[PDB]
Design a protein around this motif. Structure first.
Motif, PDB file in Angstrom:
ATOM      1  N   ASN B  67      36.548  -5.302 130.557  1.00 32.00           N
ATOM      2  CA  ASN B  67      37.614  -5.203 129.575  1.00 32.00           C
ATOM      3  C   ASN B  67      37.003  -4.962 128.199  1.00 32.00           C
ATOM      4  OD1 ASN B  67      39.230  -5.780 131.755  1.00 32.00           O
ATOM      5  ND2 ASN B  67      40.274  -7.530 130.807  1.00 32.00           N
ATOM      6  N   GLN B  68      37.852  -4.585 127.249  1.00 30.23           N
ATOM      7  CA  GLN B  68      37.400  -4.190 125.924  1.00 30.23           C
ATOM      8  C   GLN B  68      38.106  -5.017 124.863  1.00 30.23           C
ATOM      9  OE1 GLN B  68      38.905  -0.821 123.708  1.00 30.23           O
ATOM     10  NE2 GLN B  68      36.902   0.189 123.804  1.00 30.23           N
ATOM     11  N   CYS B  69      37.388  -5.284 123.778  1.00 25.97           N
ATOM     12  CA  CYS B  69      37.979  -5.861 122.581  1.00 25.97           C
ATOM     13  C   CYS B  69      37.139  -5.412 121.395  1.00 25.97           C
ATOM     14  CB  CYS B  69      38.068  -7.390 122.668  1.00 25.97           C
ATOM     15  SG  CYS B  69      36.474  -8.224 122.769  1.00 25.97           S
ATOM     16  N   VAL B  70      37.617  -5.726 120.195  1.00 24.67           N
ATOM     17  CA  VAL B  70      36.941  -5.356 118.958  1.00 24.67           C
ATOM     18  C   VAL B  70      36.284  -6.604 118.390  1.00 24.67           C
ATOM     19  CG1 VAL B  70      37.192  -4.403 116.646  1.00 24.67           C
ATOM     20  CG2 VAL B  70      38.580  -3.510 118.521  1.00 24.67           C
ATOM     21  N   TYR B 176      32.881  -2.495 119.500  1.00 24.55           N
ATOM     22  CA  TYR B 176      33.617  -3.043 120.625  1.00 24.55           C
ATOM     23  C   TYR B 176      32.755  -4.041 121.380  1.00 24.55           C
ATOM     24  CZ  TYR B 176      36.446   1.062 119.647  1.00 24.55           C
ATOM     25  OH  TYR B 176      37.205   2.026 119.024  1.00 24.55           O
TER      26      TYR B 176
END
Ligand SMILES: Nc1cc(NCc2ccc(F)cc2)cc(C(F)(F)F)n1
Ligand SMILES: Nc1cc(NCc2ccc(F)cc2)cc(C(F)(F)F)n1
Lengths: 202, 206
Positions: B67-70, B176
């Motif tokens: 999964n991705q986040c900042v 990211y």
């Protein structure tokens, strides 16, 4: 004398910083408001003759137009407070693809990688008003500007899903597509420095 | 428990260290791998890599197991030899760069993300940033480098900047954090984000 395009993702106060500065440096100025999906499309029409376009839509190598960034603005993923994903104690974006999304634009006409819908189940709308009207009704979730949802959040009318992904909203570059000819004009540069400085305050 | 983490060479050192201190606080064992942003996402896609977190600027949505986040932001500059042709132009645009040779990252073979895709038709690839600047300083072409990597060469007039019209003060680039899907339900991972993000914000102010 000058024709300028601002998409509906630009907060209104910025439409004010642009007005005051351009009217100072030019005789006549015309303003148009469009959805971010329709921004770049509108300036590409030969009959449009639009000199400046301030939008979030990304697209490099546009004929007759150069690109620069003026600043940033925030956007939130929002859904009905009682929407399932809100109640999920843990939030993720990989899961949103499984729920219906209320997005902008039309099925016909390509969407930039920025505004392309993420979900397979999608329901399109013309403006941001129509998006929230359906999202508040629990039809699905959507991506809206901060200013367009600031009240509905304060009043608990709407929830946020983007707080794990990017707390405080998702920073989105604000590009300024300017007709290449304007690059050699002292007035245009004065507009950028001012427009950018005023845009930072937010 | 055990964590294996990848940071690309675009993350400033203070940014890397701020991440390190938090991981070692919230986890028992931590290993670091450093790669160019062009090879960052590619490395975690190999099953044999067994990398749990990857912090990079490279964009790519819908990654298996990840999964991705900042996590934060970093600055990047377009740089060229001071006597480069475009330098003499007091005002620069990006449409014009397409005609000049670019010293870029990555490999010639192998798809490039829309972010790191070279803009010019005439391109010369390099494995890391050192080799990029070595060619740019030699006037071979222009390139995109992190702020921390060229801050020195700029103060010393050894190198010029072309991006001040496009985005003054450097070009903000999201950083990211691609995290293995498993970590989402672990109290250690959330505390790491909350802490790492807060420290990186305070740092960004300074
Ligand atoms: N589609 C869309 C994207 C925007 N930013 C990029 C982004 C992409 C994925 C994501 F989860 C969050 C933000 C902003 C808007 C707007 F409504 F604010 F204009 N719309
Ligand atoms: N290729 C590349 C792109 C980066 N940001 C996107 C971008 C593209 C064009 C531009 F003018 C400015 C920024 C950052 C880096 C890094 F070296 F900092 F990692 N490299």
């Amino acid at each position: 004398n000058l024709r300028v395009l601002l998409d509906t993702a630009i907060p209104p106060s910025f439409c004010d910083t642009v007005s005051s500065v351009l009217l100072d440096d030019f005789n006549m100025v015309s303003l148009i408001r469009t959805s971010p999906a329709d921004s770049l499309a509108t300036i590409k029409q030969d009959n449009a003759e639009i000199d400046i376009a301030i939008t979030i839509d990304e697209e490099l190598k546009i004929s007759r137009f150069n690109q620069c960034v003026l600043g940033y603005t925030k956007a939130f993923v929002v859904a009905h407070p009682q929407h399932p994903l809100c109640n999920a104690s843990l939030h993720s974006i990989a899961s949103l693809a499984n729920y219906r999304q209320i997005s902008l634009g039309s099925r016909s006409g390509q969407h930039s990688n920025l505004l392309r819908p993420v979900s397979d189940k999608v329901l399109f709308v013309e403006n941001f008003d129509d998006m929230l009207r359906l999202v508040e009704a629990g039809v699905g979730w959507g991506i809206a500007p901060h200013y367009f949802v600031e009240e509905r959040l304060r009043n608990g009318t709407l929830a946020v899903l983007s707080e794990l992904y990017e707390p405080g909203g998702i920073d989105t570059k604000v590009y300024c597509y300017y007709n290449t000819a304007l690059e050699s004009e002292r007035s245009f540069l004065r507009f950028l420095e001012s427009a950018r400085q005023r845009l930072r305050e937010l």
